[PDB]
Amino acid sequence: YNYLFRLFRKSNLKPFERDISTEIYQAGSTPCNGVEGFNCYFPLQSYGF
C-alpha cells in the first residue's frame, strides 16, 4: 500500500504541476467541515500492489 495516487481535483493538472494538497475535495452543494461525507471526498488512494 506504500504507493499512492490522486483520484479527484477541481481541474486537471497543468504541464509539470506537482500538487501535494490533501484537503477534502468538495464535489457539490454540501460543505465538508474538514471531514469526508456527502459530496466531500479525500483526494488520494493506494494501489495496494
Partner: protein, 42 residues
C-alpha cells in the same frame, strides 16, 4: 530583499520563498513553518 509566492502562503503547503542576505541568494519551496512576516531583524 525578498519575496513569498504560492496560493495560501500559510507556511503549511508548498510555497516559494526567495531571500537575499548579501553573502548568498537563498530559495526554498518548503512545506514548513515560517513567520507570518519573516522580515530580516537586523
Amino acid at each position: 530583499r525578498g519575496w513569498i509566492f504560492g496560493t495560501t502562503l500559510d507556511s503549511k503547503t508548498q510555497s516559494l520563498l526567495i531571500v537575499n542576505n548579501a553573502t548568498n541568494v537563498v530559495i526554498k519551496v518548503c512545506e514548513f513553518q515560517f513567520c507570518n512576516d519573516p522580515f530580516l531583524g537586523v
